């Protein structure tokens, strides 16, 4: 959970700052700003372009690519609604906050943070001044397929995506229960997840609505 996939993280963090300071983003910039090589930074991005994260440019500079910006992101958003928490909440005292909010970004589920920028006054900038990143990306709440479990519970309809089915003959069926945009009963079982509506009816959707339809937590 935190010497590997963490370290991941760190060094995507670290490129990220430098991208938001106006520093190119260069090994020996990294290894001095972790306190790292020895085990150089040079094996950890090596393992991280196999991945997929980032490429080594022409020149030296480290550029992420999609993917590995997107994870990045997740991390700063992570780290700096901890500093948010930490400072406004907690009342760390704000020498300390930068470190423990470093070792938080690890360990923080997405839900979590969902509840922070609820229970946050303001989620704008850290206590530090920069913009946290990614607010958006929190919220396609998610395909329900995925945040479907056994255990029922109530969700929003972000998007039906209708456009995109070929099986048509659960439209109408969505339309009687209603089911546009608005909570509903989501449950799994037999991996086939049911719906009730603002009007007591259940629906089964068929693989594909199921992979296509995307909820969002409330």
Not at 148 to 164: D, G, H, L, Y
Not at 208 to 216: K, N, Q
Request: aromatic residues 2%.
């Amino acid at each position: 959970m935190k010497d590997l996939v963490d370290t991941t993280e760190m060094y995507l963090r670290t490129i990220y700052e430098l991208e938001e300071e106006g520093v190119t983003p260069l090994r020996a910039r990294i290894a001095e700003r972790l306190e790292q090589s020895g085990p150089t930074v040079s094996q950890t991005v090596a393992r991280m372009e196999r991945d997929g994260l980032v490429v080594v440019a022409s020149d030296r500079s480290l550029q992420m690519t999609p993917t590995g910006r997107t994870l990045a992101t997740a991390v700063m958003r992570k780290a700096r609604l901890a500093e948010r928490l930490l400072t406004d909440i907690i009342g760390l005292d704000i020498n300390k906050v930068h470190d423990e909010a470093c070792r938080w970004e690890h360990v923080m589920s997405d839900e979590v943070e969902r509840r922070l920028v609820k229970v946050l006054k303001d989620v704008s900038r850290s206590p530090f001044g920069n913009p946290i990143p990614g607010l958006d990306e929190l919220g396609p709440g998610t395909r329900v397929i995925d945040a479907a479990t056994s255990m029922p519970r109530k969700v929003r309809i972000v998007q039906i995506n209708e456009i995109f089915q070929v099986e048509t003959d659960q439209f109408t069926q969505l339309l009687d229960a209603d089911i546009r945009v608005g909570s509903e009963v989501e449950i799994v079982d037999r991996d086939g997840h049911i719906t009730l509506s603002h009007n007591g009816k259940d629906v089964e959707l068929l693989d594909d609505l199921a992979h296509t339809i995307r909820i969002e937590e409330l």
